[PDB]
Each structure stands twice: as structure tokens, then as C-alpha cells.
């Protein structure tokens, strides 16, 4: 019934705009209003802007207007939403929704597939790979922690494993943080009794084959 | 300004009564309308009840909704659950010039529910010239898989937290997923030591570690 | 289509002297009530707002009067009280929508109004259809009352305080209610319809 087709850039460099629409296809989009809402990771819905049906209407939260501005086009039956000052803290994905019934704005009734615009650079460098150094002290606790961690690498995934027998190793997945210090780490849990004091030496095997660069070093003991 | 509170998860034996309650304060909750909205995994969201009392063509008839004037709250019941019902619910409200989406409660028809464990070590001396710190908290073998980690260090948040997107292990069908964040030294040192609180269920027994370092 | 004229009235009213300004033989275009951004409370009660287009009423109305701001949620059916009593009695089956919005920076003085005033109390409900303007003297007690306050009689008339230091609940606000009635008539009034 109803079917929304987004076209546009995607990945933006800073220093340039892009260029976003929504294009309206299978409705009457002269009818009826239209919306533009932001949804951050990981946090819920957030409001940005509002357009009533001639447009007239434009309000804007006030600790980021000025540089966001909403539009629309009722004539070439087409959306446009253009941004303006994009920072570092504007990278999410995008979506444009339509009011539930005519006149009401109140409420949202149909999500696109939406567009993903970025403001930031890409590096897809440096394994910065620094040894985990083993820890137990089992005082009657039978516990042991380690695991091999790489730090700002693009681009993902990557393949690390106990290649042996057991394939119920517990693998992460990396966190793909943009903002408040945000450093990727990988990190991974096995099950093995308290022979790890020492005696038997565990080495992260990582070999970044299509960039032939790679850190190895060393495993040393506690401090304590 | 207009934050709200609500429980992380609520579960009930079944043949009990259950709903979902996004419950507002300063303001009245009924003076205007509560839109419910159903957010399936990799899905479109799309509108399952409108204005409290009207359901959208298709909708089941199992779904409904009303509002009790005596505590003055928004509550949506769903009887009868069933596996192709599970999805994200959401509360909606509009304040004035702004709309504000609450956390909403999660609602999920599911087998073994075994309390998780928490395994930390924070002499990671070796990560220390890296970055300023990361405690470990491996959290797997949850249900449901879906977690979120909640801490106030004494009477004041920390902003390092740091999440995963539990992904689904190869063919095992289970959860992994763990929560870090980069610690200031004096928060672990001036107490006697920094633990992981995670909310899995209702059934918490201990929740107690006992941690013996050099 | 002068809602807009109802709107931006200078003055208004006593709260017991509420006004009647009839619609009728006007066709309604209903764009005033689009723009709820400017509006605090948009509810209606035993009609359903989408469908008030697509259906025809025979006859509308409008209301406007003002009052205080925390009494928009005793507006409501079902509802008991003194203001739900003496001041308005809203029916179970009343069909309608309240609307009301902020007008303490316009409606509010430094040294408080004194220019809307009501009874406040009275032996029973009023009668359906009545304007209340009646200022009968209060008499709890046997003893007869000279209109002057002394032993057992008690002033009902009461000033209400308008200031600075005064909470949220006594900001004066603008109450708009509209009622659509389709009795044993034809319709009379239609929406554009698009």
C-alpha cells in the first residue's frame, strides 16, 4: 500500500553539503504532511524539526537552531531536507515519515527505509595490539581472565579464534562509538581451569593479511 | 527538562495479568494523547494503536488499551502471547513546541532464564598507557538476551559506559554481550573496590563478589 | 470564516458569565484547530476528531471563557466536585472538544485582576440550560443575615490574589470549547471535503 523510495549521498566529508530527498511514490503526497525525525544509536526517537501542511510553521529546539533547517516542496512533489553546520555529535541514520492522517502532526504513520549520512574521517589504520597480561589469583575462586584486544581498526570485522578443537569460544563484537571518548575494543572469554598461572602461555595469533601489518609481543607476568 | 522514569523490564507468571505502563509525571499523562508503537527488529515501525482507543485495520483483536483515572497512566495489556507478537513498544507524548519518546517497557513471549555471572579483574596495568582504563564485565548465557547495564558511581553517573549490540553467536542462538567504560583511578581506590551491577531478572540471590588482590 | 475574530478577543468574561456564539450557515474550513502548537490541551470527548470533517453536524458551537490553568483536567465526564457542580456539570454524554493555551503573559496583572467572579457555593447542581447569575447570600445557619458580616454570616463573595509569588496553579489561562449537536435535523454545516 504504501511504498517510500529515499535517494541521495551517503558517507559526506566534512567541508561539503549533501544533497537529501525523500521522494513521494504510490501516495498523494500534496495531501498529506511530512516529517523529518533523527534516531540516534542505541537512544529512542529524538525530535528535530516539524513542517506544518504550508510550511509556514518551522520549530527547531533551541540549544541547535540556526544551523538546522527544515523544508519541503509541495510543488515538485518531492522532499528535501538540507543541513546545514554539520558537527561531530550530527552523525546517525536518517528517516522521513508522514503524519498519521491528514492535518494531524501529532502522531508518525509510515518509516522509509531511510538514508545514513556521516560527518567524520576514516583512518582504517593502526592495530595498536598491546598483550593482556594474564591475572587469576585463585583464592578459592577458580577464575581467570584474558583475552586479545585490538584498538581503531577499520575495516571490520575481525577474525579472532582458538583454532583448535572447541568452537564455543566467546567472541565481541566491537562498539562503533562516535562520541564521549568512544575507543573500540574486541575482547573474548575462555573457559579453562587454573593452570593459567604461568605455566602455560596463551599468544593472540593475528595476522592483518590484506594491510601486512601486524603487532606481536611478548606476554609478562603480574606486578601484584 | 522533561525526563521520565521507568522500570528496565517487568515479567509475570503466566495465566497473571500483565500490561505495559509508561507512566509520566509533572503533568498530567491524560491531558493529551498516548500514541502506541510497535519497533520489530530490522522492521519499519508501524502504528499497531492510535489515541487509546482505535485499532488499525489488520491489527488483532487481542490488542487494547485504555486509561485509569485513578493513578492517571497510560497501561496497554496484550492477552494471550504469542511468538509472532514479539517486537519494541514504545510510549509517545508531545509537550508544547517539542515531542518527547519515553523508554518504554519491553514485552517478550519466550525457556531457561539461569541467573548470569559477573568476572572482573581491573589490575590491567598493561592497557594503562594506551587508554586511561576499561573494567571487564563478560556477561553470556542470559534470557532474555537483551540487557542493559545501569550504573550511578556513588551519587553521580558515569559517562564512559560503553555497550555492545548483543549479537547472536553462529549457530548457538544465544547472547553475548558486556558493558566497559573507562574508570578514574580514584574511584575504585578511595572505596574498597568497584563492582558490576547487572540487571538480568527479578530472581537476584547474592549479588555479592569477593575479590582478594595483592 | 471569523474564528480567528473569536480568538483574538481583548476582553473576557466572568467565569460564570460565560458566552454562547452561535455557528451556523457558515461553511467550515476547521484550520484553526491544525495549528496546536500554540495549543495547551487538544481533547475531545465523545467524538472522534479524524472523522469531524467527513461528517456533517446541523448545528456547532463555540464557547470561550478563562480560568485557572490546574483546572483543565477537571474537565472531564464522570467527574465530581465543586467546580464540576456549581461552576459546570459536564454531561456523560457530552460531545464536544475542550481546547485551551497559555495566556499568563498577556491575561495577568502585577496588582491581580479583580474582574472575574462567581458563587462559590450553592444548596445543589445547577439546571441544565441556566446562566448563573444569581448572588444569592450564603447562609449556613439559622440566623438571619442583614447583609452585613457578623454572628453565623459569612460574605459569599471572595477575591481572587493575582501576584508574583503565587504558584503555577494561578496563572490565568484562555478555555475555548466547541460542542457540535445533530438533533432530529438536517445537516447544515459540511467540511470542504478536499
Known amino acids: 500500500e504504501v511504498q517510500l523510495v529515499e535517494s541521495g549521498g551517503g558517507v559526506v566529508q566534512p567541508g561539503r553539503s549533501l544533497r537529501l530527498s525523500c521522494a513521494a511514490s504510490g501516495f498523494t503526497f500534496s495531501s498529506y504532511g511530512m516529517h523529518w525525525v533523527r534516531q540516534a544509536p542505541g537512544k529512542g526517537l529524538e525530535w528535530v524539526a516539524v513542517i506544518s501542511y504550508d510550511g509556514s510553521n518551522k520549530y527547531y529546539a533551541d540549544s541547535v537552531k540556526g544551523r538546522f533547517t527544515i523544508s519541503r516542496d509541495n510543488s515538485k512533489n518531492t522532499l528535501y531536507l538540507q543541513m546545514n553546520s554539520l558537527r561531530a555529535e550530527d552523525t546517525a541514520v536518517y528517516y522521513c515519515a508522514n503524519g498519521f492522517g491528514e492535518y494531524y502532526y501529532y502522531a508518525m504513520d509510515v518509516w522509509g527505509q531511510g538514508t545514513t549520512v556521516t560527518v567524520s574521517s576514516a583512518s582504517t589504520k593502526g592495530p595498536s595490539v598491546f598483550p593482556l597480561a594474564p591475572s587469576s589469583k585463585s583464592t578459592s575462586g577458580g577464575t581467570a581472565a584474558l583475552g586479545c584486544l585490538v584498538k581503531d581498526y577499520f575495516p571490520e570485522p575481525v577474525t579472532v579464534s582458538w583454532n583448535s578443537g572447541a568452537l564455543t569460544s566467546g567472541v565481541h563484537t566491537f562498539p562503533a562509538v562516535l562520541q564521549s571518548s568512544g575507543l573500540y575494543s574486541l575482547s573474548s572469554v575462555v573457559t579453562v581451569p587454573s593452570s593459567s598461572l604461568g605455566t602455560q602461555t596463551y599468544i593472540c595469533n593475528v595476522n592483518h593479511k590484506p594491510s601486512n601489518t601486524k603487532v606481536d609481543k611478548k606476554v609478562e607476568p603480574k606486578s601484584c | 527538562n522533561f525526563m521520565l522514569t521507568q522500570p528496565h523490564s517487568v515479567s509475570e507468571s503466566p495465566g497473571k495479568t500483565v500490561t505495559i505502563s509508561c507512566t509520566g509525571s509533572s503533568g498530567s499523562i491524560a491531558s493529551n494523547y498516548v500514541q502506541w508503537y510497535q519497533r520489530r527488529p530490522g522492521s519499519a515501525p508501524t502504528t499497531v494503536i492510535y489515541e487509546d482507543n482505535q485499532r488499525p485495520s489488520g491489527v488483532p483483536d ?50 531457561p532464564k539461569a541467573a548470569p555471572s559477573v568476572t572482573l579483574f581491573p589490575p590491567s596495568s598493561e592497557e594503562l598507557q594506551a587508554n586511561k582504563a576499561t573494567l571487564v564485565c563478560l556477561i553470556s548465557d542470559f534470557y532474555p538476551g537483551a540487557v542493559t547495564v545501569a550504573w550511578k558511581a556513588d551519587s553521580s553517573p558515569v559517562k564512559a559506559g560503553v555497550e555492545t549490540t548483543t549479537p547472536s553467536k553462529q549457530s548457538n542462538n544465544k547472547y553475548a554481550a558486556s558493558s566497559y567504560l573507562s574508570l578514574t583511578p580514584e574511584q575504585w581506590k578511595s572505596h574498597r573496590s568497584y563492582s558490576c551491577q547487572v540487571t538480568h531478572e527479578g530472581s537476584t540471590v547474592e549479588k555479592t563478589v569477593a575479590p582478594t588482590e595483592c | 470564516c471569523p474564528f480567528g475574530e473569536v480568538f483574538n478577543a481583548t476582553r473576557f468574561a466572568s467565569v460564570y458569565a460565560w458566552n454562547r456564539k452561535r455557528i451556523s450557515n457558515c461553511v467550515a474550513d ?27 453536524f446541523t448545528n456547532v458551537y463555540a464557547d470561550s ?37 497559555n495566556s499568563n503573559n498577556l491575561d495577568s496583572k502585577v496588582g491581580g485582576n479583580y474582574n472575574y467572579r462567581y458563587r462559590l457555593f450553592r444548596k445543589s447542581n445547577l439546571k441544565p440550560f441556566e446562566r448563573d447569575i444569581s448572588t444569592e447570600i450564603y447562609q449556613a445557619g439559622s440566623k438571619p443575615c442583614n447583609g452585613v458580616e457578623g454572628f453565623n454570616c459569612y460574605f459569599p463573595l471572595q477575591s ?13 489561562y484562555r478555555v475555548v470549547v466547541l460542542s457540535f449537536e445533530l438533533l432530529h435535523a438536517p445537516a447544515t454545516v459540511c467540511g470542504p471535503k478536499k
Not at chain 2, 63 to 74: K, T
Open chain 2, 62 to 111: 487481542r490488542f487494547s488499551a485504555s486509561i485509569d483515572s485513578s493513578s492517571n497512566s497510560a497501561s496497554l495489556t496484550i492477552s494471550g502471547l504469542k511468538t509472532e507478537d514479539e517486537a519494541d513498544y514504545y510510549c509517545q507524548s508531545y509537550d508544547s513546541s517539542n515531542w518527547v519518546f519515553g523508554g518504554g517497557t519491553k514485552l517478550t513471549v519466550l525457556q
Open chain 3, 30 to 56: 476547521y484550520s484553526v484547530l491544525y495549528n496546536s502548537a500554540s495549543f495547551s490541551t487538544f481533547k475531545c470527548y465523545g467524538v472522534s476528531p479524524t472523522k469531524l470533517n467527513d461528517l456533517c
Open chain 3, 65 to 101: 471563557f478563562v480560568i485557572r490553568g490546574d483546572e483543565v483536567r477537571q474537565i472531564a465526564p464522570g467527574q465530581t466536585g465543586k467546580i464540576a457542580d456549581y461552576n459546570y456539570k459536564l454531561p456523560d454524554d457530552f460531545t464536544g472538544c475542550v481546547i485551551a493555551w
Open chain 3, 160 to 172: 481572587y490574589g493575582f501576584q508574583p509569588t503565587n504558584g503555577v496553579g494561578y496563572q490565568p
